[PDB]
Symmetry: C3
Subunit: 527 residues, 3 copies
């Protein structure tokens, strides 16, 4: 029988860990780049890199906030090199995707009301945000099995290089904020930390590493190809919106609250102030194409098959209640179907306030969804729209927000709508995998215990470090040395504005490398 009530304690290698901090050299659309040099003969190994960033004080007028997870979304590229060349590098989006299921890391990177609420400044000396510090955990393959997987610095110099996104990507602002001055005075202030191990009589062996590689397809094309694929551990596919043909303005943003319901509530709250008006006579200050009708005594207004029920309490006797019946409208033919945001409401109740002269709304019944919240403003007024799209007031138009978040997936802010209806993967000339529903995404989420998985083919099911990973292997004789992806996009109604949001296909392939430690550290691609 095997003893399950006692073990023989082995004696491990003699070592001592230490937390080490380093300052870097900054160089410069003059993209900012920081380089850090690690050179110490007593550091035998290292892992768990953490980057810290000091965000400065922001003063002035207007509305301003940071995007959620600002620390992660400010990073464009990270590279780790030695004298033999690059050892490992990655783009910001792949790092974010790898860390998306680590709630503590996400929270450390900057996720709080103080950073992400959209604050308001009233005078040029008002303080909008106080200074603070965020930390970015740079997850690497060297962390998966603690000491067993650490990177050995075989008496070489290690350089870490961080490339930063332009500050316009991490800021959410309205048009009143003095962004040009802010961008002129903003500077990145970084510092790198890691755990070092001073080891006595270390015994080094060769090991195994996976390096991600991203390919981005052409605009609106449904194909993409990764070349020179000889030993890959997985393949992922997803889509990104392209907002380069717009002005990047949006009606609302919820800030720190990030549920779907929160998005919808922020949107509805922004529309309600212009949708129902209590006025002495016909309300003024709206464009000529607005159709504002007076609410009858029974409270029901008809908008061609759609009925809206409006009841406001405490309305002054010299005033009436009006309903904006075409607040936002879009169509491609003069007498065809119309997408009308006013028709998405069925019941509106509330009470007029004499002291503040505005309506405080209570219960709302509606059918707004995340796609409606994700339509960009410039598409409402594009050239293909045969109507005047934006019939809002000037005060409402002055509250629109610029949003340039670089890691958005799908065509909405939550990646909730699935726009891929068929996926087909070819390895060489033959079909390797095809599916209609998102069964591969379901399997990805099940196997990784994540809520935000992607369509992923996994080829490796063996334990990570103690076994060589299982791969799909090339056959250059038959020409099996490339992976081509082809999708079929879902069909949308030609009269919905979201039909004209452009998209790009993204393919991610994880290639296998061999790590050898003779003549310091070097890698060679497994073929």
């Amino acid at each position: 029988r095997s003893n399950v009530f006692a073990v023989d304690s082995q004696i491990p290698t003699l070592y001592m860990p230490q937390y080490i901090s380093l300052s870097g050299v900054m160089t410069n659309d003059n993209q900012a780049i920081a380089s850090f040099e690690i050179r110490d003969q007593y550091i035998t190994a290292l892992n768990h890199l953490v980057l810290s960033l000091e965000l400065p004080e922001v003063k002035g007028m207007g509305r301003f906030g940071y995007v959620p997870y600002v620390g992660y979304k400010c990073i464009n590229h990270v590279s780790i090199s030695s004298c033999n060349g690059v050892i490992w590098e990655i783009e910001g989006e792949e790092l974010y995707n790898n860390c998306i299921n680590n709630t503590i890391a996400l929270k450390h990177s900057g996720y709080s009301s103080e950073l992400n609420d959209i604050s308001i400044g009233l005078t040029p000396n008002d303080t909008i945000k106080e200074p603070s510090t965020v930390y970015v955990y740079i997850k690497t393959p060297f962390d998966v099995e603690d000491t067993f997987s650490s990177l050995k610095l075989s008496d070489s110099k290690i350089t870490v290089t961080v490339t930063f996104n332009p500050v316009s990507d991490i800021v959410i602002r309205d048009s009143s904020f003095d962004f040009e001055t802010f961008n002129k005075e903003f500077v990145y202030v970084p510092e790198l930390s890691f755990i070092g191990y001073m080891v006595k009589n270390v015994q080094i062996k060769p090991s195994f590493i996976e390096k991600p590689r991203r390919v981005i397809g052409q605009i609106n094309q449904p194909t993409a190809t990764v070349t020179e694929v000889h030993a890959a551990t997985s393949l992922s596919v997803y889509t990104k919106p392209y907002y380069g043909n717009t002005d990047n303005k949006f009606i609302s943003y919820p800030g720190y609250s990030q549920d779907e319901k929160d998005y919808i509530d922020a949107y509805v709250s922004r529309l309600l102030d212009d949708l129902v008006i209590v006025s002495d006579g016909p309300p003024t200050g709206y464009p000529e194409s607005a159709e504002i009708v007076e609410v009858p005594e029974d409270g029901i207004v008809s908008i061609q098959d759609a009925d809206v029920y409006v009841k406001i309490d405490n309305v002054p006797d010299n005033m009436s209640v009006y309903l904006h019946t075409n607040l936002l409208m879009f169509g491609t033919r003069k007498n065809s179907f119309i997408y009308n945001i006013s028709k998405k409401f069925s019941a509106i109740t509330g009470t007029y306030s004499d002291a503040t002269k505005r309506t405080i709304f209570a219960h709302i019944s509606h059918s707004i969804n995340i796609i409606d919240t994700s339509i960009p403003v410039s598409l409402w007024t594009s050239q293909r729209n045969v109507y005047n799209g934006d019939n809002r007031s000037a005060e409402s138009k002055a509250k629109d927000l610029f949003i340039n978040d670089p890691f958005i997936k799908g065509i909405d802010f939550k990646n909730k709508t699935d726009i891929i209806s068929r996926l087909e993967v070819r390895f060489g000339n033959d079909v390797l995998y095809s599916e209609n529903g998102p069964i591969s995404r379901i399997y990805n989420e099940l196997l990784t215990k994540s809520n935000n998985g992607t369509r992923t083919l996994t080829f490796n099911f063996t334990p990570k470090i103690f076994f060589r990973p299982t791969t799909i292997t090339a056959n250059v004789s038959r020409g099996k040395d490339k992976l081509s992806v082809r999708v079929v996009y879902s069909t949308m109604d030609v009269n919905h504005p979201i039909y004209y949001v452009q998209k790009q296909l993204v393919v991610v392939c994880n290639d296998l490398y061999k790590v050898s430690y003779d003549q310091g550290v070097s890698i060679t691609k497994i073929m």
Copy 2:
């Protein structure tokens, strides 16, 4: 010293995984049954079964929603067989209990506002629910240790058989919905997915598997027995309500929100409309046994020792505020104790609305609990009640809901009340285990890291796949070959309606089987 900074990477078996999808054959109270045949010489092993279901579009009038986790609660029985007979099978409740701690699987099975809100249809062409798809992860013993635990198809045919519950179990509806037509036109549309492994030169060994077995006791009896127990790894005990002697109608249901507080708020919101009435003269439309009194100037109404404080703002000068002092009442003797739902309120405030002619309530102080929310309507008006139990209005009575959820435990919707006061387990003739408090449930939750454990005796503490599980073993000579369970139910007040909810004892025993792969796959019960 053992090296903790390097390992020797072993080379694993050469294999390649693949996602596979299959359609099935449907046959038919004409219970629906689907059978799926897996036959491919290149599939060496498989695991991670996932069932997908397409739910159709629902139109018409009335109120309609799906129960939470509809995908899991639609399954009655799953069986896996070969030519040598059944290999593994399980009932829906055991599968649900095994997956209850997997939040991602639960969410994939169908848990969202679009499915579980109680939606309303106004015209016979109104769309209540849009079509959608859910996925059910069928957790099997072959998943616990990935490739190590997978099922080997030794050149045999594998059949998966799914038996479905009648659609009445998964639907929550009011009496206005045309359920007979819906049930006539509803059809299950299933598809099975799994991960297959094509293996090169596989080396097969015998392995170990546990098969659950359920026994249900007789109505209201406090005993149950599992026979032919020779090697069991665990034993569980819990209770189920039996609603077969009622009409299955309930006053309220919270829908997507599933906290205890949410249940209570939905219940209170449904009662408040009938409990406080603003009327011109004595309110009409209530049964003759209602005792509706006018609220005095100090706002305090006395109901025999109980005092209710009622203050409503903006009451018209030609109207008064009334309180229903016996909205629901139950008692067994004419002058004994009375359970009166009106006496569970202590303070009620709000404001009358002239525009909508209804009261919008603000702060409520009450002592309603989950048992009150879980009493079925038919028990309020049973023959043993000496009063007229339901003194609500017809409009309120028309909003009651049918609920037939098949996996309810305890006597309330959350299984919060513990109705077992003593548990005694006998193996043969001698006492094997007895307890007063729920210390075995506490231990179950601690060891499995679950929030919804049950009273469980665990006999196996060894690692799952690399060791033979530890069991309690029979001794047929002394007659130790049966487990008999006896409980003592808690004592309830004879004047509480919940005292008359019937219950059944459920015992679950996990038996050990041996898996051999000679002459294909076959199992033999370990004795």
Copy 3:
């Protein structure tokens, strides 16, 4: 190739587990102590200790609730001994810190609305709390690797000793509650449970254990030292507030809701009733130093550079709205800076209610923070304050709460403010570690997957039970045998009341011991 599709199942030691329950002997500021004796020749090993406590029914008048996690916070000290002396012991705070990341254990210890809401009693026979039972999981080193790590009772007697905190520590109450009577009649009722293993032919080996050791520095001193440190696995540093120079009264407490936002909302709700008053003529019942001004027609009141916007709806025509412009004020010089709580509000809206004669507030804009919510009442009226600090009404002053929670860290209830600006650790005479930012806390949280980490130096990265832990080792020749900690506290404004909250430095060191089982169980400190 290594087989990854099959294993050889080893046969483990023959054993059988059993749940065992024991009653104890109670002895007695007459601190209560319970001792439990475990003596049974058939119990070979044990682990997973669980303590149960019955809390009694509480009746009377006033406001009363239990602190969150009452079961954990009622324990002062736990000790495990045999005839050779103490084997393992720990203080309540170290146990709490070790279990803080186990949500299920925390919830079992007593975390619910029924226990932690601040309930109200109206008559001397009112029931404030119903009886209930909580369970405290006493995490020990013997649990980390189930059977492998269990404690072997080599035919010796084991004694478990629990020392309880005085009941004043676990109760939150107002001054109306009859605490002297409650304390006279309260008694602890404990019971110990554990999992025992009856083992056949056990094979015992020596093993390894870590024992925590706490040192508390002197009041306001920024140093502390742990002597006789020869082999430590980690070191932790944090701070505690000392409320011994106050009366322990606080303005508000949120109860069951424990987010920062919840603390702030409870505080703001308590202030609003005294901050804005609707009255017929100048409001009465406030101290003479109150400066209550009438709100002008534009609704803007100026308080020296600060502007407050006040608009209340439905104000009677014979009444006006007043604002309390110095509700709480503190300063050290007569004409210097002033900390004024009235100036932390910028906008206040609401509606007066004629039926209940009070204001129901709606939207509030403010800058209150957790430090404001954590200032004790007695510091507002200390001798160093040159103003009268508390200008509240008597009704508001009668609602203050005593809070004596013994495990508070930092200077606020959430340990959110970081008051350590520099930390320096010396081992012998040389600097072992120094940092400015909380990078060691970040690393602690990353490595332990916790949201509530502390500043911690970790010396052991090897797997726990199968390897001897790695340590920092003494060198008594050079005098490396002590760890001295020195911090630099952050600088606060001399006109903020929180500057005068006293604090203590806490250092925790984990020493290594050897466990041998010859002559029963005994330990010897590793040197």
